[PDB]
Amino acid sequence: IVDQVITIGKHVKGYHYIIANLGFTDGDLLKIQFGGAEVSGFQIVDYD
Amino acid sequence: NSIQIGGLFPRGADQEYSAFRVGMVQFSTSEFRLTPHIDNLEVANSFAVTNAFCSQFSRGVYAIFGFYDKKSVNTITSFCGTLHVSFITPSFPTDGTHPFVIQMRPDLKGALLSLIEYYQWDKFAYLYDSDRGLSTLQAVLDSAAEKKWQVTAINVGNINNDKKDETYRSLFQDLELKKERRVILDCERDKVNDIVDQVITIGKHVKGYHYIIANLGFTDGDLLKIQFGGAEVSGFQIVDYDDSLVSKFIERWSTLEEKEYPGAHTATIKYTSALTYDAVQVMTEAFRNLRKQRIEISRRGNAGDCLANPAVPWGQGVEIERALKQVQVEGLSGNIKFDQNGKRINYTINIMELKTNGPRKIGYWSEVDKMVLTEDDTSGLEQKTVVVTTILESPYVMMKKNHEMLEGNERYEGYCVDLAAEIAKHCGFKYKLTIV
Amino acid sequence: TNAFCSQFSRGVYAIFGFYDKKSVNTITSFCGTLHVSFITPSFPTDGTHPFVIQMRPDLKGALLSLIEYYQWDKFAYLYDSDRGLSTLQAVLDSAAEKKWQVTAINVGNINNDKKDETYRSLFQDLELKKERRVILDCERDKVND
Ligand SMILES: *[C@@H]1O[C@H](CO)[C@@H](O[C@@H]2O[C@H](CO)[C@@H](O)[C@H](O)[C@H]2NC(C)=O)[C@H](O)[C@H]1NC(C)=O
C-alpha cells in the first residue's frame, strides 16, 4: 500500500496515515520519511 | 583489402561496444574489410588518451572511432587537427569548429530552446554538471537575456557520492525560495536517475511540477517510477522504434546471445550505443567511396612517432576526412548528414512526453523547421463554446460604439452581457454571444 | 604535449609555464603522472591537481564579497570563457542563496571586424531591462576594448 501511494504521490504534505498495528517500526518507513505526509503508528516494543 | 582503424572505448561502455560488433558483421563487405584495433581506456584521463592515440597512429590507422570526456576532448581535437587523423564519435559536439572530427551526436541546443518557448516557460531552474561542456548553459543564458527569463542555474555535478543527501535538501530549499516548479535536467544519465529518485522521495513529482530531460535518449533511462506521479515529463528521442529500419534492427538485437553481446538483450538501445552502430556504417561507406572514386589512400610507410618533430601530416588525411564528411546514409538516428566541420545537419529529433500508458511522441524537431507537433490532436479539449442566444434590446444587450474594430464577445455590452459573464463565471464555461 | 615532453626528456627538475582552458588538463594529467612539478601564474585549477604550484591567488571569494558589500541584487555579468567559467558558476551557484538576478552575457566569442558593432548591440540591449550594474571578468585587453 505504501509503494502504491509513493508512486501516485499521495505522501506529500496534507496527507496523513495511521498504521494500525503494534509494530510501527517493524516495517519500512524510510520510503515515506521525507515525502511530507504525516505518519503515525503504535509501538509495543520500547527499545529505550 | 585490409583497412586498419582505431577504436577507443571507455571502461564499461559494454553496450556501445556490442553495438560496434553487430555493426561490424552487418556492414562488412567483400570489397574490403575494416580491421579495428581496440583500445580500452579511462577516457577521462588525458595521459592515457594521448598514449592510446599515439599507439593507433604508430600502428598506421586510417581513422579512429572513439569517445572523449570534455576534460579530454582538447587532446583529441589537437592531435587530430595536427596529424590529420580522422576521428568519429557519438560523444557531445565540440566547442566550435574542429577539423577531422566527425561528431555523430546531433546538436541538441537548438532543440531544447524550441521546446521552452513551446510550453511557454518564463522562469525555471537549470541543473547541470560540466561533463558535456557548458556550451548548452551558455545557450540558455544568452537566450534568457534576449527573451526575458529568470533562470536559477545550479551546478549539481560536483556533489560527492559519499555525502550526497544534505546537498539535495539545501538544493531544494534554494529551489523552494522562489517556489520553483519548472526544472530542466541537463545531466549524465546516471546523475539523472539519482535526482529523479530523490525527487520522488521528497514528493516533488506530483501535478504542478514539470521536468524536461535534456538528452537524446528519453526512453533510454527509467521512466516508470515517475510515470504515475502526476508531474509531466518531457524529453528527446533520437532513436525512433517505429521506423521499419530501427524496428527490424531491434528484432535481431533483442535476441542476440547475451554472454557474447552484453546488454544487447533489450527492446531498447542507448543513443550512445545506437550512434556507434551508425558510426560503423559511415566508416564503411567512406572507404567505399574512396575506391569508387579510385583514390589511393594506403600508408606510404610507418607513422612512426606521433610526437615527431617537426610534425608532418600524412597526405591522404585530407582525402579521408572529406570522404567521411561527404557521406549520406540512413541509420538508427534518422537521416545522417554532415557539414564541413563534422556536425549533424538535416537531422530529426523526436519530442516525447511521459504519459500514463508510457512515453509518447507529440512531435519532432528539425534544424530547419524548428518545433513541429505531429498531427495527433486529441478530442479531450472539450472547450464546448456554449452558444448563448440573446436579443438586441436596450439596455439588456447593446452594441458598443466601435464594435466594428472589436470581435467575439467584446462587440456587445449591456445587462444580459454583464449577466452572461457572472453566469458563466459561477458555472464555469466559455461562451459565444450570438443574437437570435 | 610536445613541449612538455621536450622539456622532460632533457630531464628538467621542474617546469615554469602558462596554460589555457583548452590545455590545462594536458599539463595536469602529465604532471600528475610523471610527478613533474609545474609553477604557473595562470588561473588555478578547478580541482585538487597536485604538482602544480599556482602563483596567482584564488579570486572567487573576494568578488563574491565585494558584490555583497555594494548590496547588489540584480546585475549583468559579461564573461570571457578564456579562463574557465569557474567564477561564472561561482556567482551562479550563489544566485539562489544570496538572492541575485544575474544576466550572464558571453562575450569571448566576438570578432575584431565587427567589434564596434556587437559591443554596441550588447549595451543597446541592456537598455531594455535597464540595468546599471555590470561585472567585466576579462583579460585586461578585453576590458579596455
Ligand atoms: C534531408 O533529410 C531528409 C529527411 O530525413 C532526407 O529525405 C529523404 O530522401 C530520400 C531520398 O530522396 C527519400 O527516399 C525519403 O523519402 C526522404 N525521407 C523523408 C523525407 O523522410 C533528405 O535526403 C535529406 N536532404 C539532403 C539534401 O540531404
XYZ file of C-alpha atoms and ligand atoms in Angstrom:
657
model
C 0.000 0.000 0.000
C 2.935 2.305 0.763
C 4.730 1.783 -2.558
C 1.469 2.315 -4.433
C 0.923 5.565 -2.539
C 4.515 6.630 -3.219
C 4.204 6.208 -6.990
C 0.997 8.234 -7.410
C 2.302 10.849 -4.986
C -0.140 10.646 -2.092
C 2.582 11.015 0.518
C 3.149 14.764 0.376
C 2.167 17.397 2.937
C -1.563 17.497 3.634
C -1.865 13.723 3.632
C -1.870 11.705 6.858
C -1.570 7.990 7.622
C -2.079 5.966 10.805
C -0.638 2.442 10.705
C -2.880 0.272 12.880
C -0.573 -2.320 14.421
C 1.786 -2.704 17.384
C 4.753 -2.809 15.020
C 5.166 0.690 13.601
C 8.942 0.279 13.492
C 8.697 -3.353 12.378
C 8.282 -2.318 8.745
C 9.886 0.009 6.207
C 9.284 3.706 6.880
C 12.195 5.395 5.082
C 10.306 5.429 1.782
C 7.691 7.799 3.251
C 10.051 9.546 5.635
C 10.618 12.759 3.682
C 7.567 12.932 1.419
C 5.562 15.378 3.510
C 2.593 13.323 4.655
C 2.021 12.665 8.343
C 2.600 9.117 9.507
C 1.531 7.756 12.884
C 1.606 4.305 14.465
C 1.844 2.246 17.628
C 4.943 0.654 19.152
C 4.552 -2.115 21.724
C 8.300 -2.739 21.998
C 10.096 0.236 23.552
C 13.798 -0.015 22.712
C 14.586 2.699 25.257
C 41.813 -5.104 -48.753
C 42.858 -4.918 -45.103
C 41.955 -1.473 -43.752
C 43.119 -0.587 -40.233
C 41.058 1.668 -37.957
C 41.404 2.865 -34.360
C 38.934 2.000 -31.617
C 38.859 3.957 -28.360
C 36.325 2.773 -25.770
C 35.877 3.890 -22.136
C 35.984 1.278 -19.369
C 32.495 -0.177 -19.074
C 30.763 1.047 -22.209
C 29.730 -2.552 -22.879
C 26.542 -1.927 -24.878
C 28.335 0.607 -27.072
C 30.991 -1.993 -27.843
C 28.490 -4.760 -28.616
C 26.683 -2.388 -30.959
C 30.081 -1.767 -32.547
C 30.369 -5.514 -33.188
C 26.886 -6.016 -34.634
C 27.696 -3.067 -36.862
C 30.856 -4.895 -37.917
C 29.025 -8.007 -39.094
C 26.082 -6.123 -40.624
C 28.062 -3.676 -42.788
C 31.054 -5.928 -43.507
C 31.574 -6.493 -47.221
C 33.845 -8.500 -49.522
C 35.211 -5.497 -51.396
C 37.110 -4.649 -48.233
C 37.116 -5.369 -44.503
C 37.664 -2.862 -41.703
C 40.286 -4.165 -39.283
C 39.607 -2.477 -35.925
C 42.286 -2.303 -33.258
C 40.612 -1.617 -29.911
C 41.985 0.449 -27.019
C 40.225 0.151 -23.655
C 40.982 3.311 -21.727
C 39.910 5.595 -18.909
C 38.596 8.260 -21.280
C 38.632 10.867 -18.503
C 42.411 10.522 -18.168
C 44.130 12.654 -20.819
C 47.510 10.956 -20.360
C 46.030 7.596 -21.327
C 44.212 9.188 -24.260
C 47.396 10.768 -25.627
C 49.133 7.400 -25.298
C 46.345 5.320 -26.823
C 46.113 7.722 -29.745
C 49.856 7.607 -30.432
C 49.577 3.816 -30.383
C 46.854 3.863 -33.052
C 48.916 6.344 -35.046
C 52.177 4.386 -34.879
C 50.387 1.201 -35.970
C 49.162 3.069 -39.022
C 45.408 3.519 -38.765
C 43.421 5.374 -41.410
C 40.824 6.716 -38.965
C 39.921 6.422 -35.285
C 36.486 5.870 -33.802
C 36.187 6.657 -30.117
C 34.774 8.741 -27.291
C 36.032 11.680 -25.244
C 35.415 13.461 -21.971
C 35.109 17.250 -22.065
C 38.283 17.145 -19.993
C 39.996 15.106 -22.695
C 38.464 16.329 -25.975
C 41.128 19.020 -26.433
C 43.892 16.421 -26.683
C 41.715 14.740 -29.322
C 40.890 17.814 -31.429
C 44.573 18.782 -31.327
C 46.231 15.528 -32.357
C 43.514 15.104 -34.994
C 43.724 18.648 -36.340
C 47.508 18.289 -36.457
C 48.219 14.772 -37.722
C 45.078 14.965 -39.896
C 43.854 11.810 -38.175
C 40.115 11.354 -38.659
C 38.026 10.948 -35.501
C 34.485 9.579 -35.300
C 32.460 9.990 -32.094
C 28.932 9.655 -30.642
C 30.106 11.992 -27.876
C 28.981 15.605 -27.483
C 29.678 18.277 -30.162
C 32.959 20.197 -29.951
C 33.003 23.783 -28.691
C 33.394 25.335 -32.125
C 34.758 24.236 -35.483
C 37.341 21.484 -35.090
C 38.665 19.676 -38.187
C 38.915 15.908 -38.728
C 36.265 15.275 -36.089
C 33.093 13.532 -37.212
C 30.589 14.161 -34.409
C 27.783 11.613 -34.777
C 25.862 13.255 -31.946
C 23.356 15.803 -33.310
C 23.406 19.304 -31.814
C 20.784 19.365 -29.057
C 20.852 23.034 -28.001
C 18.585 24.233 -30.805
C 16.005 21.583 -29.971
C 15.827 22.398 -26.253
C 15.406 26.130 -26.852
C 12.414 25.499 -29.117
C 10.656 23.360 -26.513
C 10.972 26.067 -23.856
C 9.034 28.654 -25.862
C 6.549 25.893 -26.728
C 5.500 25.214 -23.131
C 5.797 28.987 -22.726
C 8.004 28.833 -19.635
C 9.234 32.186 -18.312
C 11.054 31.203 -15.131
C 12.772 27.884 -14.456
C 15.703 26.104 -12.818
C 18.524 24.716 -14.943
C 20.501 21.924 -13.267
C 23.742 20.592 -14.734
C 27.196 19.101 -14.484
C 30.134 20.014 -16.714
C 30.696 16.579 -18.285
C 29.417 17.629 -21.721
C 30.680 21.193 -21.661
C 28.693 24.255 -20.681
C 28.004 25.274 -24.277
C 24.375 24.401 -23.521
C 24.287 26.515 -20.367
C 25.679 29.450 -22.346
C 22.794 28.932 -24.756
C 20.155 29.177 -22.029
C 21.825 32.251 -20.536
C 22.165 34.173 -23.800
C 18.566 33.297 -24.657
C 17.159 34.253 -21.246
C 18.598 37.729 -21.671
C 17.038 38.179 -25.116
C 13.591 36.802 -24.220
C 13.290 37.845 -20.554
C 13.728 34.677 -18.487
C 14.674 34.275 -14.832
C 16.872 31.190 -14.675
C 18.210 29.589 -11.499
C 21.282 27.697 -12.701
C 22.700 25.310 -10.110
C 25.821 23.175 -10.643
C 24.959 19.728 -9.301
C 27.818 17.601 -10.617
C 30.473 18.371 -8.017
C 28.338 16.613 -5.406
C 30.252 13.879 -3.597
C 28.590 10.461 -3.653
C 29.809 9.986 -0.076
C 27.700 12.765 1.443
C 25.022 13.045 -1.234
C 21.954 13.953 0.831
C 22.371 17.240 2.718
C 23.424 18.604 -0.668
C 19.949 17.864 -2.021
C 17.804 19.329 0.748
C 19.727 22.608 0.625
C 19.326 22.369 -3.146
C 15.544 22.100 -2.853
C 15.446 24.847 -0.260
C 17.083 27.219 -2.728
C 14.621 25.757 -5.225
C 11.838 26.414 -2.741
C 12.959 30.011 -2.214
C 11.207 31.133 -5.396
C 8.781 28.190 -5.329
C 10.472 26.856 -8.466
C 8.227 24.300 -10.162
C 9.730 24.095 -13.642
C 13.095 22.327 -13.789
C 15.428 21.340 -16.630
C 17.774 18.353 -16.283
C 20.942 18.511 -18.386
C 22.985 15.713 -16.828
C 24.732 12.380 -17.337
C 22.103 9.605 -17.432
C 23.430 8.315 -14.103
C 23.049 11.722 -12.461
C 19.573 11.884 -13.979
C 18.179 8.847 -12.151
C 19.831 9.830 -8.865
C 17.997 13.163 -8.993
C 14.674 11.622 -10.035
C 14.915 9.106 -7.188
C 15.491 11.912 -4.693
C 12.664 13.964 -6.207
C 10.277 11.030 -5.723
C 11.269 10.704 -2.062
C 10.628 14.360 -1.228
C 7.438 14.265 -3.283
C 8.194 16.807 -5.994
C 6.866 14.580 -8.768
C 3.123 15.233 -8.489
C 0.876 17.525 -10.526
C 2.287 21.055 -10.507
C 5.836 20.066 -11.391
C 7.124 19.766 -14.962
C 10.558 18.336 -15.733
C 12.451 18.447 -19.037
C 15.161 15.824 -19.566
C 17.867 17.230 -21.842
C 19.385 14.279 -23.719
C 18.951 12.243 -26.914
C 17.647 9.209 -25.037
C 14.307 9.775 -23.323
C 13.090 6.172 -23.121
C 16.711 5.151 -22.558
C 16.651 5.649 -18.790
C 13.946 4.614 -16.330
C 10.604 6.388 -16.747
C 8.130 4.166 -14.913
C 8.966 5.441 -11.416
C 7.596 8.920 -12.172
C 5.103 7.774 -14.801
C 2.212 7.840 -12.328
C 3.464 10.662 -10.116
C 1.330 13.286 -11.820
C 4.199 15.533 -12.858
C 4.624 15.910 -16.610
C 7.944 14.733 -18.016
C 9.258 15.690 -21.437
C 12.467 14.764 -23.219
C 14.048 13.973 -26.560
C 14.409 10.765 -28.578
C 16.904 10.242 -31.395
C 16.039 6.563 -31.837
C 12.545 6.093 -33.276
C 11.470 2.495 -32.653
C 8.679 2.979 -35.199
C 10.950 3.226 -38.236
C 10.947 -0.114 -40.065
C 14.732 0.194 -40.264
C 15.053 0.566 -36.490
C 12.214 -1.905 -35.896
C 13.926 -4.662 -37.894
C 17.152 -3.831 -36.044
C 15.528 -4.321 -32.634
C 14.307 -7.805 -33.608
C 17.804 -9.214 -34.160
C 19.248 -7.008 -31.412
C 16.934 -8.125 -28.600
C 17.632 -11.791 -29.401
C 21.441 -11.951 -29.622
C 23.328 -14.168 -27.179
C 23.904 -12.053 -24.063
C 27.052 -13.831 -22.877
C 28.574 -12.715 -26.174
C 26.843 -9.372 -26.751
C 26.377 -7.869 -23.251
C 23.418 -5.578 -22.579
C 22.052 -6.160 -26.065
C 19.158 -8.367 -24.943
C 16.782 -5.422 -24.511
C 13.920 -3.919 -26.511
C 15.645 -0.542 -26.258
C 19.172 0.675 -27.000
C 21.038 3.696 -25.635
C 21.549 6.537 -28.091
C 25.251 6.484 -27.242
C 25.311 2.857 -28.383
C 22.959 3.433 -31.318
C 25.196 6.177 -32.713
C 28.166 3.806 -32.508
C 26.176 1.400 -34.675
C 25.502 4.273 -37.085
C 29.156 5.301 -36.943
C 30.271 1.916 -38.286
C 28.071 2.272 -41.378
C 29.595 5.687 -42.115
C 33.138 4.333 -41.803
C 32.249 1.678 -44.392
C 30.631 3.981 -46.965
C 33.541 6.400 -46.532
C 36.252 3.944 -47.559
C 33.919 2.508 -50.201
C 33.606 5.897 -51.883
C 37.396 6.255 -51.746
C 37.835 3.257 -54.045
C 34.789 4.032 -56.194
C 36.482 7.351 -56.924
C 39.652 5.288 -57.441
C 41.547 7.433 -54.929
C 44.553 5.726 -53.343
C 44.988 6.020 -49.563
C 47.309 3.242 -48.323
C 50.135 4.172 -45.934
C 53.465 5.012 -47.570
C 55.228 3.608 -44.517
C 55.237 3.803 -40.735
C 53.604 6.716 -38.962
C 56.500 6.171 -36.581
C 56.173 8.630 -33.731
C 53.216 10.953 -33.200
C 55.464 13.396 -31.332
C 57.822 13.558 -34.326
C 59.447 16.988 -34.564
C 58.620 18.742 -36.705
C 55.153 17.241 -37.073
C 54.364 16.298 -40.663
C 50.829 15.173 -41.567
C 50.321 12.309 -43.983
C 48.750 13.464 -47.240
C 45.625 11.333 -47.584
C 44.245 12.593 -44.259
C 42.707 15.478 -46.175
C 41.218 12.988 -48.642
C 39.896 10.598 -45.988
C 38.242 13.315 -43.887
C 36.399 14.593 -46.957
C 35.120 11.102 -47.751
C 33.741 10.856 -44.220
C 32.211 14.331 -44.255
C 30.614 13.689 -47.662
C 28.792 10.535 -46.532
C 24.987 10.472 -46.575
C 23.298 7.405 -45.092
C 20.186 6.308 -43.199
C 20.559 4.565 -39.842
C 19.258 4.271 -36.278
C 19.276 8.032 -35.631
C 17.096 9.009 -38.592
C 18.763 10.662 -41.581
C 22.501 11.352 -41.372
C 24.320 14.293 -42.969
C 27.306 16.485 -42.113
C 28.686 19.928 -42.861
C 32.359 20.741 -43.435
C 33.046 20.594 -39.698
C 31.507 17.195 -38.991
C 28.363 18.425 -37.243
C 24.957 16.873 -37.884
C 22.521 18.703 -40.157
C 19.103 17.862 -41.622
C 18.579 15.515 -38.662
C 15.335 14.623 -36.889
C 14.771 14.805 -33.130
C 11.627 13.267 -31.614
C 9.822 15.152 -28.840
C 8.401 12.795 -26.228
C 6.086 13.446 -23.285
C 5.673 10.973 -20.433
C 2.053 9.879 -20.016
C 0.050 7.196 -18.221
C 0.375 4.401 -20.784
C 4.033 5.271 -21.315
C 6.293 7.679 -23.237
C 4.656 9.356 -26.224
C 5.715 11.464 -29.200
C 3.905 14.785 -29.524
C 6.061 15.937 -32.426
C 9.508 16.296 -33.983
C 12.205 18.957 -34.343
C 14.322 19.781 -37.380
C 17.170 22.290 -37.610
C 15.169 23.969 -40.364
C 11.548 23.533 -39.246
C 12.166 24.048 -35.517
C 9.289 22.744 -33.389
C 6.732 20.672 -35.281
C 3.962 18.846 -33.437
C 2.692 15.695 -35.147
C -0.963 15.955 -36.164
C -2.061 13.823 -33.212
C -4.528 16.288 -31.690
C -6.962 14.803 -29.191
C -10.704 15.275 -28.720
C -10.199 15.719 -24.985
C -10.087 19.509 -25.152
C -13.856 19.896 -24.813
C -13.867 23.725 -24.920
C -17.581 23.398 -25.682
C -18.285 27.001 -26.615
C -21.742 27.148 -25.064
C -23.912 29.013 -27.563
C -25.745 31.838 -25.808
C -28.667 33.323 -27.710
C -29.909 36.822 -26.926
C -31.942 39.739 -28.281
C -30.766 43.175 -29.413
C -32.680 45.196 -26.812
C -31.679 48.127 -24.590
C -30.249 48.049 -22.050
C -30.150 44.242 -21.845
C -27.858 43.724 -24.842
C -26.327 46.558 -26.876
C -23.602 47.113 -29.473
C -20.501 49.034 -28.419
C -19.620 52.332 -30.127
C -16.709 50.833 -32.066
C -17.954 47.236 -32.222
C -16.652 47.130 -35.800
C -12.982 47.011 -34.808
C -13.818 44.604 -31.979
C -14.848 40.948 -32.280
C -16.382 37.957 -30.495
C -17.910 38.767 -27.115
C -16.277 42.209 -26.942
C -18.655 43.541 -29.600
C -21.636 43.722 -27.237
C -22.421 45.497 -23.964
C -25.362 45.531 -21.564
C -27.236 43.974 -18.650
C -27.545 40.466 -20.078
C -23.992 40.705 -21.433
C -22.731 41.502 -17.941
C -25.031 38.775 -16.648
C -23.657 36.348 -19.248
C -20.286 36.806 -17.569
C -21.470 36.295 -13.976
C -23.469 33.235 -15.025
C -20.626 31.648 -16.979
C -18.156 32.545 -14.241
C -20.081 30.858 -11.428
C -20.974 27.965 -13.740
C -17.538 27.682 -15.340
C -17.786 27.695 -19.133
C -16.606 29.570 -22.213
C -19.480 31.036 -24.199
C -20.284 32.727 -27.510
C -22.614 35.740 -27.523
C -24.852 35.470 -30.583
C -28.004 37.398 -31.462
C -31.152 35.475 -32.428
C 52.236 17.874 -25.161
C 55.270 18.110 -27.441
C 56.861 20.962 -25.486
C 56.278 19.369 -22.070
C 57.914 16.134 -23.210
C 60.742 18.036 -24.903
C 61.462 19.611 -21.528
C 61.002 16.294 -19.754
C 63.336 14.263 -21.999
C 66.158 16.691 -21.171
C 65.461 15.810 -17.548
C 64.417 19.151 -16.088
C 63.713 19.161 -12.354
C 60.718 21.487 -12.549
C 58.717 23.404 -15.149
C 57.572 27.022 -15.172
C 54.809 27.785 -17.663
C 51.399 29.173 -18.580
C 48.321 27.252 -19.731
C 44.806 27.689 -21.114
C 41.314 26.281 -20.510
C 41.848 24.174 -23.635
C 45.170 22.768 -22.453
C 45.074 22.782 -18.644
C 44.070 19.112 -18.494
C 47.136 18.158 -20.540
C 49.533 19.963 -18.190
C 47.841 18.424 -15.149
C 47.484 14.788 -16.266
C 51.087 14.694 -17.485
C 52.325 16.317 -14.274
C 50.132 14.095 -12.131
C 51.527 11.017 -13.858
C 55.192 11.924 -14.337
C 55.308 13.710 -10.959
C 56.740 16.770 -12.701
C 56.144 19.983 -10.753
C 54.527 22.896 -12.559
C 54.776 26.536 -11.476
C 52.076 28.717 -13.036
C 50.955 32.370 -12.813
C 47.858 31.396 -14.816
C 44.397 30.775 -13.332
C 44.229 27.979 -10.699
C 42.789 24.544 -11.440
C 39.076 23.873 -10.919
C 40.071 20.998 -8.654
C 42.802 19.491 -6.497
C 45.506 18.588 -9.026
C 48.919 18.071 -7.373
C 52.409 19.000 -8.587
C 51.026 22.350 -9.753
C 52.124 25.467 -7.888
C 49.569 28.124 -8.851
C 51.162 31.515 -8.192
C 48.033 33.634 -8.598
C 45.638 33.570 -5.619
C 42.011 32.458 -5.875
C 39.824 35.459 -6.711
C 36.366 33.835 -6.399
C 35.897 34.593 -2.701
C 36.827 38.268 -2.992
C 34.471 39.162 -5.852
C 31.537 37.483 -4.105
C 32.241 39.587 -1.027
C 32.599 42.887 -2.897
C 29.258 42.384 -4.635
C 27.723 41.814 -1.208
C 29.434 44.974 0.048
C 27.780 47.044 -2.689
C 24.476 45.436 -1.695
C 23.518 44.450 -5.248
C 20.636 42.126 -6.143
C 20.295 42.471 -9.910
C 23.236 42.821 -12.285
C 24.772 41.808 -15.609
C 27.812 39.542 -15.780
C 29.760 39.770 -19.037
C 32.162 36.835 -19.092
C 35.113 35.533 -21.087
C 35.433 31.762 -21.452
C 39.236 32.072 -21.741
C 39.880 31.445 -18.033
C 37.293 28.714 -17.488
C 33.727 29.518 -16.419
C 34.641 28.720 -12.784
C 33.858 32.217 -11.497
C 30.743 32.484 -13.653
C 29.405 29.397 -11.887
C 30.591 30.717 -8.514
C 28.191 33.659 -8.753
C 25.534 31.454 -10.369
C 25.707 28.856 -7.593
C 25.320 31.727 -5.139
C 22.485 33.347 -7.101
C 19.952 31.304 -5.127
C 21.214 31.570 -1.532
C 22.187 35.235 -1.884
C 19.062 36.044 -3.944
C 20.566 37.574 -7.106
C 19.088 38.284 -10.548
C 22.104 37.629 -12.755
C 22.159 38.171 -16.512
C 25.159 36.286 -17.906
C 26.209 37.564 -21.333
C 29.023 35.654 -23.025
C 31.476 37.961 -24.780
C 34.541 35.833 -25.505
C 33.315 34.917 -28.993
C 33.294 38.203 -30.904
C 35.499 39.179 -33.852
C 37.524 42.343 -34.436
C 35.963 43.004 -37.839
C 32.543 43.701 -36.329
C 33.941 44.535 -32.886
C 32.472 48.041 -32.733
C 29.012 46.811 -33.744
C 28.387 43.803 -31.491
C 29.651 45.599 -28.382
C 27.103 48.327 -29.086
C 24.447 45.695 -29.801
C 25.020 44.287 -26.319
C 24.679 47.572 -24.457
C 21.735 48.788 -26.544
C 20.168 45.506 -25.436
C 20.668 46.145 -21.735
C 18.948 49.460 -22.360
C 15.994 47.086 -22.293
C 15.944 45.643 -18.778
C 17.547 48.944 -17.765
C 20.278 47.523 -15.547
C 23.173 49.742 -14.490
C 25.402 47.335 -12.572
C 27.840 45.223 -14.581
C 30.809 42.929 -13.912
C 33.547 42.542 -16.520
C 35.607 39.361 -15.831
C 38.105 39.602 -18.692
C 41.778 39.547 -19.571
C 42.924 43.188 -19.366
C 42.715 43.632 -23.144
C 39.059 42.615 -23.293
C 38.467 45.130 -20.509
C 39.858 48.113 -22.421
C 38.025 47.050 -25.569
C 17.430 15.680 -45.511
O 16.728 14.787 -44.684
C 15.592 14.305 -45.353
C 14.644 13.666 -44.349
O 15.388 12.888 -43.443
C 16.062 13.323 -46.414
O 14.937 12.825 -47.102
C 14.636 11.556 -47.733
O 15.170 11.499 -49.041
C 15.149 10.203 -49.599
C 15.880 10.206 -50.938
O 15.464 11.309 -51.711
C 13.708 9.736 -49.757
O 13.702 8.425 -50.275
C 12.987 9.743 -48.416
O 11.607 9.526 -48.625
C 13.191 11.057 -47.668
N 12.809 10.871 -46.279
C 11.960 11.674 -45.637
C 11.531 12.931 -46.337
O 11.532 11.421 -44.512
C 16.984 14.021 -47.410
O 17.710 13.048 -48.129
C 17.967 14.999 -46.766
N 18.280 16.034 -47.732
C 19.520 16.289 -48.132
C 19.680 17.450 -49.067
O 20.498 15.631 -47.779
